[PDB]
Design a protein around this ligand. Structure first.
Ligand code: NAG
Ligand code: NAG
Length: 244
């Protein structure tokens, strides 16, 4: 049985929280619940749900007329599981923003079903909708490379250690990669992800005829300022901010 049959704009892959991930062994306190399979049109985001979305996924706030594919409950689970990594990237807010937006789209994008295809589900309760336990994210290769490049040189708070090296499994910083960096982030055995995420980093010639449209969102360059702040990550954290 297919789980994500409608791959359309304005259409979600999953919506709401279903509960604990059964494949995750009771070893470290799980900070996230898992999502309910819901290949349905995106929701209009209002009230409290708006503020959360605005604060947790700023780049997905599109004015009073906002649509998204994550409930209020899902946004709390999002920030919970991002808290660990967000801490490592507090030197360079642009890279931090990029990392967060990468997962925000995966969970909240009103178009998520175009680049997300759930592969495995689990029935958590009786009468309840099935729970999404594994999915694959389709990204454009350049979007992934640009996201990784903005973070590849960031230092850990008050240290010289590179943050991506603390996030690339058996590969160090030297061997680390846009592909592998993401592979770690969607890996259960690496104790980071709440569920199995499979990252496919495609070039246009691969996505042709797939019936899928890979994510190609704008990624902030750390040598450029965001909004009206007029502030940029240092040359030690950002190769593009050099010469200093
Ligand atoms: C996870 O599931 C339980 C039971 O439905 C619920 O108490 C909890 O709020 C959910 N989400 C979080 C944030 O753990
Ligand atoms: C989505 O998942 C189904 C089930 O594994 C698979 O057959 C289908 O090809 C996937 N869609 C892709 C790879 O675009």
């Amino acid at each position: 049985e297919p789980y994500t049959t409608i791959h359309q704009p304005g259409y979600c892959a999953f919506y709401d929280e279903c509960g604990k991930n059964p494949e995750l062994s009771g070893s470290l306190m799980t900070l996230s619940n898992v999502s309910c399979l819901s290949n349905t049109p995106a929701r209009k985001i209002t009230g409290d749900h708006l503020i959360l979305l605005q604060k947790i996924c700023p780049r997905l706030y599109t004015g009073p007329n906002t649509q998204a594919c994550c409930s209020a409950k899902q946004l709390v689970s999002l920030e919970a599981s991002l808290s660990i990594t967000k801490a490592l990237l507090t030197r360079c807010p642009a890279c931090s923003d990029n990392f967060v937006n990468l997962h925000c789209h995966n969970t909240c994008s009103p178009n998520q079903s175009l680049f997300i295809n759930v592969t495995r589900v689990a029935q958590l309760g009786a009468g309840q909708l099935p729970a999404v336990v594994a999915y694959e994210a389709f990204y454009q290769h350049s979007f992934a490379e640009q996201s990784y490049d903005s973070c590849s040189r960031v230092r850990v708070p008050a240290a010289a250690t590179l943050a991506v090296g603390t996030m690339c499994g058996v590969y160090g910083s030297a061997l680390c990669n846009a592909q592998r960096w993401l592979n770690f982030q969607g890996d259960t055995g690496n104790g980071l992800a709440p569920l199995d995420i499979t990252f496919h980093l495609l070039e246009p010639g691969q996505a042709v005829g797939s019936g899928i449209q890979p994510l190609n969102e704008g990624v902030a360059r750390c040598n450029e300022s965001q909004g009206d702040d007029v502030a940029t990550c240092s040359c030690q954290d950002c190769a593009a901010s050099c010469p200093a």
